[PDB]
Design a protein around this ligand. Structure first.
Ligand SMILES: CN(C)c1ccc(C(=C2C=CC(=[N+](C)C)C=C2)c2ccc(N(C)C)cc2)cc1
Ligand SMILES: CN(C)c1ccc(C(=C2C=CC(=[N+](C)C)C=C2)c2ccc(N(C)C)cc2)cc1
Ligand SMILES: CN(C)c1ccc(C(=C2C=CC(=[N+](C)C)C=C2)c2ccc(N(C)C)cc2)cc1
Ligand SMILES: [Cl-]
Ligand SMILES: [Cl-]
Ligand SMILES: [Cl-]
Ligand SMILES: [Cl-]
Ligand SMILES: [Cl-]
Ligand SMILES: [Cl-]
Ligand SMILES: [Cl-]
Ligand SMILES: [Cl-]
Ligand SMILES: [Cl-]
Ligand SMILES: [Cl-]
Ligand SMILES: [Cl-]
Ligand SMILES: [Cl-]
Ligand SMILES: [Cl-]
Ligand SMILES: [Cl-]
Ligand SMILES: [Cl-]
Lengths: 210, 210, 210
């Protein structure tokens, strides 16, 4: 058949919970990664995450997330580089008798936590320990060095505030609704509402039901 | 012979009209792409451009263009992500019975139009629908999210104004001359002038001939 | 054995003087490159550096340097593109009878010099002719278009000043000490001091010995 069968969708992709093999990566349902233009699966988007240790920083990703091609998740902390020390060269991790009495410069940064309904643009890099709130949008080629508020749009290198998707009242409504945790039958009933800007109307409907 | 035969030139490269296979990519003569450090041809620099549909955004590139290695041309619009909607997750493009009544969130951005004599730095990303005027210079690692004026130099992420190559009078002279549309014999006669900053002198010469 | 044997360390890597084949690349001892997530060795991090000519810009890298994965070193000057000329299209490097009388637009930028104890973040791009002082830190995804002072931290695209690692007195102490040139026995004795922020204490100790 056509050469289109070789390609993958720009609007869709392989779900995360159908390709992740690293046990230190927690992913929610329906979250996918469309990485045709970088070959490797999502496991290789996560850099230097030890898959056999339980005392390392973890990568947690919510549900209904969209991750563009070539996204990078740094998961090794400072990688043994102490800027406050005299040298950033990791003497502790070079097998050399002259470096025997070096101190370990590795420092954890905490878990990298991606919320629900997060849109991560293509080739965006997420620094270790970064928390990204629900509904946030990471622009393409962004370098996220700080936390991102829920439903906040950020971009540039380093990532800085661009705008909020909705007003504070609407954001509060979505955070209380938490449609990502609704039963599958509720999403099927509210597909037309979820594909619109009418947050206040859906919030009033959700109040009567629950 | 030497290992240099395996390499490709940093000053030159394979012309675009000698390697482009996607019919939705319009390229001018002499425009080339030097992509040794990214392997793939120029067709893979253009991301998610359907090669079998005539109702999609097209990529138009002028003549005498220089495109560095790893340049990216996003050609899929918003890829079904509506930031103004409640969720950016493209329910319409996931085959799931619970998403049957979703609305299509895809929105075209218009054709990406690259003018004549455009220098695109290596690993620069061009967002969908961006128009770049004649003679503009795209710095390396740029993320061009807005239109670029003729003979404007832009850089950074997102791309912002750096400078104009020449004065407004000189730019007007070059836009009226349009040497990229001259016969091949006129360029051969004016090779020494085209390789200099003497725009006003060449404009006076072109007035007497035409 | 384990799948960990296939991987390489994020804290360490193959030393530069154990993998560099290009004779126009001068590297110091202990400097390494950890490029697991980009496949190629350090020779392919250096772009368009002619390995058989002695009249080109050279890449000089000091000792005890840490280079992240995917770092890029542009080593071809302007690549024949003269922005001050009428056209940036390199007519001189296209074999065409109509371009026979073109002038050479190539211009060298000088040697790219990386000092000692320089930490270069992953996927950072170094423009041609850039000098980076001792102890500087190049943040990830940086585009270094200008010189970097010793022990200066820079980031963003284009790279701009973030901070200095230490005070002017401490920087002067480290530049006079130059521990990267100490005998191997001196580093083994001062491993605990090099893995700390006590620059002034080590400077007082070094004064008594030398
Ligand atoms: C150049 N390249 C590698 C391509 C080429 C085409 C695509 C696909 C596509 C492109 C543009 C569209 N619009 C403008 C509406 C819609 C779909 C596509 C292909 C297959 C597919 N499936 C297998 C379901 C889904 C989408 C992706 C990458
Ligand atoms: C490291 N690497 C992969 C390389 C190595 C060398 C080159 C080439 C080159 C480099 C520097 C030059 N100057 C400083 C003047 C001029 C030419 C080159 C090679 C072949 C070629 N042709 C086949 C025509 C044209 C140019 C490119 C990539
Ligand atoms: C996912 N992936 C490709 C990986 C997975 C694991 C690593 C390694 C590692 C990761 C996290 C660590 N901590 C949090 C302390 C410590 C070491 C590692 C592996 C081998 C090795 N050697 C061969 C010496 C040294 C380090 C690197 C890449
Ligand atoms: Cl993508
Ligand atoms: Cl969260
Ligand atoms: Cl994207
Ligand atoms: Cl923070
Ligand atoms: Cl901000
Ligand atoms: Cl290039
Ligand atoms: Cl145009
Ligand atoms: Cl370039
Ligand atoms: Cl615009
Ligand atoms: Cl601007
Ligand atoms: Cl790295
Ligand atoms: Cl130096
Ligand atoms: Cl790094
Ligand atoms: Cl400078
Ligand atoms: Cl600055």
């Amino acid at each position: 058949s056509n050469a289109m069968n070789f390609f993958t969708s720009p609007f869709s992709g392989i779900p995360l919970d159908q390709q992740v093999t690293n046990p230190n990566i927690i992913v929610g349902k329906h979250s996918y990664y469309s990485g045709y233009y970088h070959g490797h699966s999502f496991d290789d988007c996560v850099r230097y995450l030890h898959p056999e240790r339980d005392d390392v920083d973890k990568l947690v990703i919510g549900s209904f997330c969209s991750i563009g091609s070539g996204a990078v998740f740094m998961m090794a902390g400072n990688q043994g580089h102490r800027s406050d020390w005299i040298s950033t060269f990791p003497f502790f991790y070079q097998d050399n008798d002259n470096f025997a009495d070096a101190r370990d410069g590795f420092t954890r940064s905490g878990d990298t936590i991606i919320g629900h309904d997060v849109w991560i643009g293509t080739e965006a890099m997420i620094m270790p320990g970064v928390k990204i709130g629900h509904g946030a949008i990471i622009a393409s080629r962004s370098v996220v060095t700080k936390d991102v508020a829920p439903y906040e749009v950020v971009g540039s290198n380093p990532a800085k505030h661009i705008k909020f998707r909705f007003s504070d009242v609407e954001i509060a409504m979505l955070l209380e609704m938490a449609w990502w945790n609704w039963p599958e039958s509720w999403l099927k009933e509210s597909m037309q509402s979820l594909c619109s800007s009418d947050i206040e109307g859906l919030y009033l409907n959700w109040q009567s039901k629950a």
